[PDB]
């Protein structure tokens, strides 16, 4: 069962690296005039640690089917913070080459949507 290996591993470091890459475009601008006002919130993120993210993904290397399941799990975890439907595009593009970022091989078939 591929699901058994997913529970043992933790994909949180992979999510941080992908979202921090977006970084919300360090420069200013793109302010919506009618955007929500927002307010102070009750609570710096962890370091890059892309090596740690690959180590978690190293388990799902031989099984390409298991690799895609791990990639889709990353999409589900961060499917709420992504807004605008073009930032989600940016998340999907980086997730596809995330196995390519490591020494692993990207799955041939995978549907992130």
């Amino acid at each position, epitope marked *: 069962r591929c699901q058994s290996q997913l529970e043992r591993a933790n994909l949180r470091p992979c999510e941080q690296h992908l979202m921090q890459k977006i970084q919300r475009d360090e420069d200013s601008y793109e302010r919506d005039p009618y955007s*929500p006002s927002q307010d102070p919130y009750s609570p710096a993120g962890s370091s890059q640690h892309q090596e740690r993210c690959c180590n978690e993904l190293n388990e799902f290397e031989n099984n390409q089917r298991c690799m895609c399941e791990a990639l889709q799990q990353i999409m589900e975890n961060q499917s709420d913070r992504l807004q605008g439907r073009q930032q989600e595009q940016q998340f999907k593009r980086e997730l596809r080459n995330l196995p390519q970022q490591c020494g692993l091989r990207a799955p041939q078939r995978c549907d992130l949507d």
Partner: antibody
Amino acid sequence: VQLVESGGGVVQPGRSLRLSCVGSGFTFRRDAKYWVRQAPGKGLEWVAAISHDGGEEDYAESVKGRFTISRDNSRETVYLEMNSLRPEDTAVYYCATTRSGWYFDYWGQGALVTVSS
Amino acid sequence: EIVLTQSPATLSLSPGARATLSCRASQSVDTYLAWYQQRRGQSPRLLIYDASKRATGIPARFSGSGSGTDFTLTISSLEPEDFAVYYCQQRNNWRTWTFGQGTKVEINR
């Protein structure tokens, strides 16, 4: 969660009428406010829009500067000061809120404004 | 500017039958489009936002699809309260909001 509108009536052309829309059950200041009217036997048309804080105000070309939109977050009320009223302005006016600033999520019961001499 | 076109303007369908609505934009508006429902003498309500997601409390029989210019709204089964007028809305350059001319759904007899 619901919007209540008041101030409708019959106004002679060239006069001025001010509409009010009180919000309750939600944070009024957290979202922007809009005004959408509907002529009898006609589709909806956006008229005025005010930001979540009143910083930016935008209006359709049908009204231009004749209409003024304002809000009082303390009263949870958004106003629509209509000036130089024309016969084409005769419509039922709605007030709407929107969390994301894009789509009119909630609507009021509507206020009927009639411009006739 | 970007204008919206709703077609057909009137649909005559039997109760409990599938309904399909179409809204077309003059140029691409990405996925930013919303659908609304307005019954006889009733305030408009939001049905579909982002042309894909379903608004809270909306029955599952209402589904939205489409991207770019062409957009489709589909009702799996026409309930008695579903016979109303539907509008499509989209926002221009963070300044103006536009609506379609409206589509009327009526019972077939």
